[PDB]
Subunit: 431 residues, 4 copies
């Protein structure tokens, strides 16, 4: 057991820090002048171009697939540094990563070569999006006897036809609402969308993922793909994750990611279990920013007293609790990603580790930001400090990438209920 | 022991609700348009105008002083209902209340008559402000051996001369940066405004409060009263609480609220204890709004499943936590204001109850909002729901009106450490 | 609205303290020497005797029914004072109160006169028990399609025959395992106990409460009522709440408390709702003792430093947190009992308030005790301070009288899910 | 970065498990009949004997010093397994380990050879004790202007004389009240113990450690070493940590561990930093036992309903919180002990990490047991389940080995306040 970083991990840290400090710090000057979410998102396009120029999108794709990702620990380090400075553009990078995951994870070299090509070129500003979430919600998307996903698909000739709505998937409409360069659209198979999901079939058997490109959208009637709105978010105010409607939207059969059913469901589950672990690094970067701002302040400011406020035990208690939350969170993320990379472990073990990580790191990042604000005091409430941004940004984490209450805890609960659940398998090995 | 509300308390609640629903809900359409904190505050002026017309400023003044305040429980009920709908203007009302308190609490009939007059007229949009807070902080303003307050006053003939800076006090600059109608400026007495506070004197013995009106400002040089900046706040984005600088600012001795010393300090302490308890009503309003929005959602939305989400035990657990926080908070605020009204209790007993109340209610209001968001899920994060606004608004409460960490817990700790501390005197008697 | 105590409420507090300080403080010297739960229980008999002689058992019974209970607030004050000193015997008094409740609450004077008689005499050491809990659990007793209570009853002739097992009900076996003076035994009506509960019938419609006394037990075959064991508890080590087996136990029809069904469930729900609120006073007593010991310690010990430890912010923060939990807890108990006493409010409003009260006060008392220990430090861990006892005692509260997780949270949840739920009805009135 | 266990790490776990299961499980039947703390401790003597025979005492001493300790990760794994089953005797082993540490850590091979000798032999039942704690408290022992330690020492001719009282240090009086085989007695140097400590002297400059064996005690008058009493503990009821008075107690100058002053305080601080980190593993073992007992119950009891209790979301949520607390704890412990072993890192980096570890692991192990009990419900309150013992055992951890409130948080606070504090040095290296 070993925690030391290799020279390439230290170089990824250095490179990510440099990118964030030299490039991302310029973003706010551009996006703050914009009056709405899409406009703010479009204001970040030049920084995502710089990201691409700096190899950061290429770094979202494994080396065997033509990318430059070295490991999930490198990835975790990169995200913590990026989110420690500015989530604008950083969010777009990870949303693209998630949207590429179902293709990265499929077992089909031919499909991969085709769809990953623009993401590993080091050119343009290509966007990917995993379109799962819906207006009616998704916590119950696999509930037997439930309505299931409201975005359905049916085969017609050599085409699939998508009917439904999505909401929240980052990058989905692209820079311009003519679509992401690659969207993985998660659908429930249904020959008659007017009829309810069959209460006697396991919903996981009915899942299909259909790949939708800008060409796909161009090849459809104007009204078949419609952006109906763009949520104005509390924080991450420069991301795009619009409300999209598909009406009789046609997709070629060659764009079906895999055979509909458990294999499709498994690809979605895997993709979101990878993101469950990595989202902890985003949570850590945000909360670390809050902790470091409070820390510097408490060591430099006496608040009209005789001593720096760090000398007050109550103030120090808050900073201590922040520090501990950040340390345990990082350790858990690194354990989780290495667990996911471990070929000798059952999926069950990986999934449970990734759920734990998502739940802990995202819940605890909120407490960390709030305790930092309490330690700094009134000054933390005004916009000449980072806290107002941080408080809004950090509250996204427990809710997003599958919220902790409806989704992650339920996924973890199912694994623990299994007769062959081995709580410590990721640590002490299996029996 | 009784929890029953009287006809006039129930009518105060109805009147507050109707005012918030018919008047306050209209404010957002006006202030949302504006580009900066000050402009948003100014867009709010017609609504404060209506608040005066509805008697809500009079209601901040006790009846023996010519106002219409009926009791602190009536007050608590009004604030809860106002903040459950819209803190814009509501905030301006409570800041005025606070700015009036040192005058209300002093026992000088001629000062009360002269300075409370606009606030009991029912006319105009008069503002008050208690100007205590400073750029450098105030948690340590009474630390023996510390620098103390950085706004100082010295007597020069029949006048006092103010040198220094205030930051945060609501309404202080008025609507137009020519000043609030009444400002109570809290100062440290210093003959030499540049020599450090004497490490050998108890800081409480050096406090003075000077009353400053738009007339006082108009009677000084332009450069003696400078507004240097206006914080852009996370929430309560329509309030004003500027950075003010006083340079050789002259105030008549007749505008000295009381004898400098323990008495001036006691007046500030008493004002901030009353606000300590009443800010709990604010936190309850904001947190209640969150809870009720989450509850209605949980009972009417299945989130793509077969049952309303209130049926999921993890969801119900959050709402149960929210409800308990609110219920215990309102009980504590009513106990505190009642304790404050009791002529039989000693000050320390009242102070300590007021401190517990500010600490508890403001800390748990935050948890209540956040748990309400977690229950609603991803939808709570977008501005078509109330929560983004509520989240920012709620975080103000543990930090403001004397932050819990630096101020209220230390006030409470001092009381607990006194030799004659009786933890249960407000309940079982002294 | 008003928080002022009356001369009678102040006297009630004075009396409870006097009894705790002069009588209950002596109990330890007697029970500490005993080897097992039952023996420890028996060693408290003389103390329960004094409590009866002080009127404390008579005080568990409403005035209209021949007792001396003045109100639920009086009761709340008394319980807090008793538990702040010694839960031995105090626990027996409240367990009796619970056992009396289904009778107190039934609408039948003739029944009440007969069964409450010994409890209001001011003599002897009569014990009551409400026997609901079972070895297999009760969180799901009203789950439709579930097994239901495993203690069943059937009418044979003009008697009822009880089959099954109870576990946990305080005082149930009496002082000598020949039975409590009054036991209210909650059963599920079944004509064939070998057949499972009908999954199509609402469990609440099958509930029956049978009154069993020492005579009822003496009139049955010796093997019809067997005590099988007595749990060794972490804290409250002087109570008795044994494991009881009923086998073809015969009870006279005149001992059926009311018509079986929703009415019988309603009496049980009402009794446990009342205790749910009053059990907060117990939690408060235990946690108050933790708090005051820590506080006096912090104000008189410098732990080798120059200043009393109360002057350290982290220590103060703990005592502040304790104080706040106790203050909010008592306010909620008084609001909840006062709510339950209000004739104008719907049951669901009273129930919901009682559930919140049980949940909040019991959870936060645990925190209060643990924080008081952290503030005092290593010294809190040794038996020359009260904390080791307070620690084990306080952990009882979130688990007992209907656990927060399986019972109280679920009862509250059901009320919140109802179409006509009014969150603030107890504070601001109904819109109905 | 790597979390894999080596074959020797796995054998250590297996061995520790076998020992706890075949040996320590039998201790209860023996100590449960005894009527006081000292007799309960004495009733565990045959079990410590087996422990020595199994090599567990030898395993407390680094190999370079003649012991078998392979690493601090091995040690953490051993302690976790032992305390998951039975803290009787396990606690004695650990107390001995702390007692040995000032010698292990000093730079005197001659002292090390002489005094470690019994502990590396594999025979008898030798006990060590680090005697720091006192009747009047120790959280303020280094406060300038404060009374300081109330156990003082002075040099008289070629001997040191000890005046004062100790309370709590485990094993301090040995099996029979004639003394531990080795006690490191921590003293404040005072020539005239009637005088107050000089408020102008830095207290750390006055610390001395005197080694005291059964020999030293035998060579002194009986009245000069008196056991005044033995605390009756809430949990860990089979340990001894008596109240002892030294009156004119004579010690040969050869038994002086090192130069009094900062060197001596340094040794005490290092020994207590190591234990701070390792006490985490004890708290994990205890909390794990609670979690596992609750899990098994939850997956096999319906509590009179139709489904196992784990299917209830509120029960699962408690179990989930327990697991995350345990998982984050072990991670922090392993990170701390490896940080402590890193020769490249400055001491304050190691100290801050050790403090983090002790505070977090001990506070959350308490929450874990109580959540476990709440999940199981009323059944958890009776002694036919483990929870009553575990609840009492777990409450020791936040209070002992330097309590979080008075000691570990202030130690961490002081480091954080340093002008050159580097929060992430143990992770991302020092600048
Ligand atoms: C910046 C941002 C980026 C995003 N990125 C993407 C993306 O790339 N792709 C994508 O598809 N989506 C994305 N989302 C959406 C995100 O993944 C959400 O987590 C997702 O919509 C699910 O939300 P939810 O967990 O609240 O579930 P919902 O289904 O909306 O349920 C909401 C709440 O209901 C309750 N609930 C419902 N069912 C249960 C149950 N069975 N048990 C207990 N409680 C229940 C819970 O309290 C839950 O929190 C993004 C959102 C944001 C804001
Ligand atoms: C909308 C709004 C309205 C307001 N209204 C008014 C008003 O009408 N009048 C007015 O005067 N002010 C007003 N304020 C300011 C408000 O009252 C603040 O609470 C006040 O400025 C004091 O801030 P503080 O508690 O953070 O103390 P600071 O002195 O700013 O201290 C900041 C932090 O330092 C730490 N600290 C400092 N000293 C200690 C110590 N001794 N012990 C432990 N920790 C310490 C604490 O963590 C504390 O939170 C308003 C602010 C806002 C945003
Ligand atoms: C089973 C067991 C084994 C033990 N092993 C040993 C051993 O081997 N060797 C040994 O020497 N001791 C041992 N101890 C004692 C243990 O290490 C205690 O932690 C130690 O006695 C110090 O206790 P304390 O942290 O509570 O400090 P104390 O000095 O007792 O202070 C108690 C409380 O006062 C408050 N306080 C005091 N000063 C401050 C401050 N300046 N700032 C904030 N708060 C303050 C804190 O709340 C603190 O918790 C053992 C005890 C037990 C029960
Ligand atoms: C001192 C003492 C006095 C007592 N007094 C009496 C008395 O006088 N009369 C009497 O009858 N009993 C009494 N009891 C028992 C007490 O009332 C218990 O609370 C009762 O046995 C119910 O226990 P439980 O809540 O743990 O439920 P259980 O049925 O034992 O359930 C245990 C756990 O399972 C889980 N669970 C089960 N079902 C669900 C569900 N549907 N949803 C979510 N979680 C679930 C919960 O985590 C719950 O805590 C006493 C016990 C003690 C120790
Ligand atoms: C790695 C995370 C992708 C951005 C957010 C995805 N999501 O919310 O599901
Ligand atoms: C009663 C509330 C007054 C408004 C805020 C005052 N303050 O923050 O100090
Ligand atoms: C009012 C208290 C009764 C004693 C305990 C009863 N119970 O746990 O159910
Ligand atoms: C690692 C040693 C723990 C046993 C005693 C700890 N202590 O309290 O100092």
């Amino acid at each position: 057991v070993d925690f030391k970083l290799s020279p390439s991990q230290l170089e990824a840290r250095r490179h990510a820090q440099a990118f964030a400090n030299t490039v991302l710090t310029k973003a706010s000057a551009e996006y703050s002048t914009q009056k709405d979410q899409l406009s703010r998102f479009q204001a970040t396009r030049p920084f995502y171009r710089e990201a691409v120029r700096h190899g950061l999108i290429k770094a979202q794709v494994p080396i065997p697939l033509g990318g430059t990702m070295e490991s999930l620990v490198h990835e975790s380090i990169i995200l913590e540094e990026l989110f420690a400075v500015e989530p604008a553009t950083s969010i777009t990078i990870v949303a693209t990563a998630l949207g590429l995951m179902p293709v990265i994870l499929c077992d089909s070299p031919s499909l991969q070569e085709k769809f990953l090509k623009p993401f590993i070129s080091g050119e343009g500003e290509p966007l990917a999006s995993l379109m799962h979430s819906e207006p009616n919600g998704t916590a119950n998307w696999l509930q037997k006897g439930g309505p299931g996903l409201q975005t359905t698909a049916r085969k017609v000739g050599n085409e699939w036809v998508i009917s439904g709505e999505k909401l929240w998937p980052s990058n989905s409409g692209g820079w311009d609402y003519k679509g992401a360069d690659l969207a993985c659209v998660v659908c429930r198979v249904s020959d008659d969308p007017s009829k309810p999901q069959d209460p006697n079939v396991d919903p996981a058997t009915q899942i299909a993922v259909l790949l939708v490109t800008r060409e796909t959208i161009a090849n459809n009637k104007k009204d078949a793909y419609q952006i109906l709105g763009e949520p104005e978010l509390a924080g991450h105010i420069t991301t795009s994750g619009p409300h999209t409607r598909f009406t009789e939207f046609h997709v070629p059969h060659e764009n079906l990611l895999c055979t509909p059913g458990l294999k499709a469901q498994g690809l979605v589950e895997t993709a979101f279990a990878m993101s469950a672990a990595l989202v902890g690094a985003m949570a850590i970067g945000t909360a670390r920013a809050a902790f470091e701002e409070a820390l510097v302040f408490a060591k430099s400011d006496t608040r009209g007293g005789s001593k720096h406020i760090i000398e007050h035990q109550s103030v120090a208690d808050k900073l201590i609790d922040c520090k501990i939350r950040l340390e345990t969170s990082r350790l858990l993320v690194w354990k989780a990603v290495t667990t996911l990379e471990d070929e000798a472990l059952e999926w069950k073990v990986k999934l449970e580790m990734a759920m734990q990580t998502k739940i802990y790191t995202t819940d605890v990042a909120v407490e960390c930001v709030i305790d930092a604000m309490k330690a700094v005091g009134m000054k933390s409430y005004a916009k000449d400090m980072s806290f107002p941004r941080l408080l809004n940004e950090v509250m996204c984490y427990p809710l997003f990438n599958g919220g902790n209450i409806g989704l992650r805890r339920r996924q973890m609960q199912r694994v623990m209920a299994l007769e062959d659940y081995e709580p410590w398998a990721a640590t002490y090995g299996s029996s």
